[PDB]
Amino acid sequence: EVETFAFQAEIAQLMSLIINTFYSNKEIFLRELISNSSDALDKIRYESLTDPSKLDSGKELHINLIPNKQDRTLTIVDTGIGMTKADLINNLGTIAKSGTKAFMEALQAGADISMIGQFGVGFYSAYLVAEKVTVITKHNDDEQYAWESSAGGSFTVRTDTGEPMGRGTKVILHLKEDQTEYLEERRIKEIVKKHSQFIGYPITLFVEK
Numbered sequence: 001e002v003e004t005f006a007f008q009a010e011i012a013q014l015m016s017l018i019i020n021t022f023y024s025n026k027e028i029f030l031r032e033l034i035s036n037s038s039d040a041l042d043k044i045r046y047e048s049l050t051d052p053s054k055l056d057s058g059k060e061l062h063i064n065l066i067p068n069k070q071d072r073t074l075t076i077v078d079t080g081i082g083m084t085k086a087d088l089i090n091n092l093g094t095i096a097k098s099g100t101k102a103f104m105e106a107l108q109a110g111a112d113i114s115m116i117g118q119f120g121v122g123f124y125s126a127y128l129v130a131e132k133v134t135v136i137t138k139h140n141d142d143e144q145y146a147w148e149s150s151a152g153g154s155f156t157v158r159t160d161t162g163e164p165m166g167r168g169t170k171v172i173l174h175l176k177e178d179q180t181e182y183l184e185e186r187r188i189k190e191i192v193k194k195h196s197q198f199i200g201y202p203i204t205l206f207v208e209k
């Protein structure tokens with residue numbers, strides 16, 4: 001049972017701009033996804049301060065980066081608050097319509113694509129490096145869902161029969177053929193050190209056989 005949705009016109013335009021604009025500094029996608037994970041971790045931490053049972057779904061608060069060269073995927077995993085099905089459909093819990101408007105008003109006014117996270121739409125920077133993005137998420141108040149999009153104006157949502165995650169989100173980047181540098185350990189380490197060195201949760205870079 002797969003539901004297919006149209007992006008709002010403004011979000012489709014944002015994704016088109018990200019995919020078609022010549023812009024060499026693609027590495028900032030990772031900082032944006034790690035920052036999103038940190039924000040989601042902050043949220044479940046705050047909820048747990050007054051209700052410790054919020055962590056019954058998992059006490060550990062962390063971020064894992066998992067490259068897989070056989071699948072050509074880079075996965076950013078966190079044990080943050082996750083998203084409900086409603087959140088997923090509603091632009092992954094963001095105010096992406098108004099954020100896009102502000103972002104595109106900044107671009108013609110001096111800004112560049114690297115400032116996308118200041119407008120609350122940093123998730124879509126995934127499409128700098130990914131031909132397809134899969135988002136698997138579990139929120140304490142809902143079941144486990146998979147969102148997916150290869151851009152082109154539409155996204156899908158289905159219940160996820162995959163490996164139960166407990167609580168949190170996995171962002172699976174199906175990398176473009178010419179972007180496989182982002183699977184190499186030394187490249188990922190360099191980027192995390194450059195742009196994510198002060199994130200307040202452990203970031204574990206997995207290695208491959």
Ligand SMILES: Cc1cccc(C(N)=O)c1C
Pocket residue numbers: 036037039040078080081082083092093094123135169171
């Ligand atoms: C905005 C967004 C998109 C995809 C995943 C996540 C996350 N890690 O919870 C967020 C905050």
